[PDB]
Amino acid sequence: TLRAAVFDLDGVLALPAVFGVLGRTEEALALPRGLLNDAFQKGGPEGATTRLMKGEITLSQWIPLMEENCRKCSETAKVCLPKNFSIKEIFDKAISARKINRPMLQAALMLRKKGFTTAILTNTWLDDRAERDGLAQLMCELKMHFDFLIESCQVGMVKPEPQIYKFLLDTLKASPSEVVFLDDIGANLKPARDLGMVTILVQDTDTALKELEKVTGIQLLNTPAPLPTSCNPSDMSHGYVTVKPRVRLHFVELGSGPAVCLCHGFPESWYSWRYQIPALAQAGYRVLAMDMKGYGESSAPPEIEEYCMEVLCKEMVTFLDKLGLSQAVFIGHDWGGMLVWYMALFYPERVRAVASLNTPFIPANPNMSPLESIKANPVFDYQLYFQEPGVAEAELEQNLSRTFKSLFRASDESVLSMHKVCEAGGLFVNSPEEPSLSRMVTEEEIQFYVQQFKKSGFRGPLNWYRNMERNWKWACKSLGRKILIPALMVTAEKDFVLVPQMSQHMEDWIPHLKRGHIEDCGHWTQMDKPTEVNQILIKWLDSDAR
Template identity: 35%
Template sequence: MPQQLPDVTHRVVPGPAGRIHLVEQGEGPLVLLVHGFPEFWYSWRHQLPVLAAAGYRAVAVDVRGYGRSSRPEAVEAYRMPDLVEDGVAVVRALGERRAVIVGHDWGANIAAGSALLRPDVFRAVGLLSVPYAPRGGPRPSDMFAAMGGEEEFYVSRFQQPGRAEAEIEPDVRGWLAGFYAALSGDTKPAPGAPDPHFAAPGGVLRDRFPAGVRPDWLGEDELDVYTAEFERTGLTGALNRYRNMDRDWEDLADHDGAPITQPSLFVGGALDASTTWMADAIEAFPVTLPGLVSSHVLDGCGHWIQQERPEETGRLLTDWLGAIGDAAP
């Protein structure tokens, strides 16, 4: 099975919520890799050996609620400060004092939050797909509820416990395949087609997923791995991250508008809604990411950057890590 990668070590370390599962490869400065939704450590399978070969200790975690890490029952156990402390616990458990943190999708938000809240531990931050946008503006649930008019934004659909699970869990494989295709550069709906980030009144998100197509990066074996993991764990732990956005907004009130000053990297996909919807956040990087070393928007790429463009992602990461060196403040 592709989950059994050669030359990697699986470990379970203690964390604030119980256990944190991680996969590591290589020796050298620690680089912590944080996945997004709906993925787990496996989304970094291409970058682990590249970073290891470049002289880094690459560690991909299962975020709280995913994979073999603990899945607390309480919804409020998935708020951002708790996830930041999970990352700190990993660094400490590995015998390190500091680390570079790189995240994709929700992992990018977690990486940004980690750099913001614990600059003593996280000396540099890489963001894939989701640009940094400082805390501010209206309450997130109010903002998302206002999007789409009569249609319902996917983040709003994910808020009520059990609702999204009822859509996804009867056919995890089919839903994941459609969701991955909907946000991939080579299979996303054509311009002008109904947006798969929104559900029509009385409909579900899956109604707008592409049918009968599979992204180039997603073979049967890869889909088997993702399906097996989410059939085993269910989706509640993963979805609970979305259910804490208002709590994050409250928890981070003291950091309203705060920049991230550590050396940083951004990589987005030109065909990713996260890049286009948040174009203003990217334009604000000189203020919000004053330590930005490099920023890249990849033509023809969708949301799943490190899987759609594995070689390019590996090169961008190693180039950036080489540029910042071991002594980043």
């Protein structure tokens, strides 16, 4: 029966409410109780405040009217306003204090996940204050989570006028008995209840969610910790930069503030950062999530040396040149982790800070050929398997769904040891035809990877592994240097290919290295433990990159 849920902003999705500051200010200043609310509501349907809420005048034009109202109210109550009494001041403070009410948003998120149409209906104003950006950010953050945002000042109607609820119903494409509406003002509920909507009077959040839970039949309270917000590819800004005649790099871009360039691993996509991209942008950064060369909508030339680290890195520098960025923070995972260490060693002027998930920095051994070093570690056997052009391509391209479903698995779910892969004849030779779906991924997310890899297959990706000698020779150039810019290494306890202990000497080359470590986290770090990754990167960004 219920199909739609409508939330107010002030006092419902955001707290403390502003009217609360009229009450609080009265108390704090020992004014006659209600004096500020009387001034706020002066004139009723024809007073300044209604004209504000309807979009007739802006907030800045309203401020001196509320002033006059406060003066007139105090005169009739035979009191004085204190010296320095400031409506602008009171409101700047109330509007900055007001924060997203997290459990209410999470309820709305969950209900939207169960198929509810969700909306914010609010009496609000056109905000032209010097400090308006704070409200713009709050509204941005809330609104992406709802089907509709209906603002009194954009539609020219205000709660409790009956016409705005008719407009709501019409916007929802729903009948009134299909709708629950939450508000902290009883007068604002009545016209909804008159049309037969279920209504909830919100005082404390938990009681409102209890009523909301009872009436929808969906669990909303005491629910597990939800995953961070993910990205919908077709809602992203997609960017494309030609770094040389046959090579264009694609990236997805979100956020403003310091530039942060995410470099994914093998065989992955910009989409592997889907959980980090909204969280980092929300944290105050300009995120650029790449398709690395070889992948997705980036170019994939066939030649092996197009994918040596020297060339890949020079291209990343040109990418910054064409975008007009003097620096970015470089955050990499897996092969992308290897790449950002080399950006830090060869182009430190272009790297604001450097972080790697899983991939350690290990200086080239100038006394041992890289192939030998690889042969010494049985877990890198699969890398020998990758050398011969065409062999791994045929196995990995043969059935893309089976490829990504076999690779992208949590640490307690694996279906492929990296064990004597050459000798076995392939990576998947003892894995199922139709693996089950990992807890980490939905069938929809697997199909995005499959679709990306239909454009160029696995040749460009595999070529990243085919420059061992060439990368070793270039790396040997850097053996006298240290990495002295801000740097973060994040180890994953149960990554069995890139194990934590392989990073144990990094402080010899990077003396001020900072660390995070994620327990119970396998190789696909960003989608395995997205919440922990988010917290570790944002904390390190805010202290070291900013």
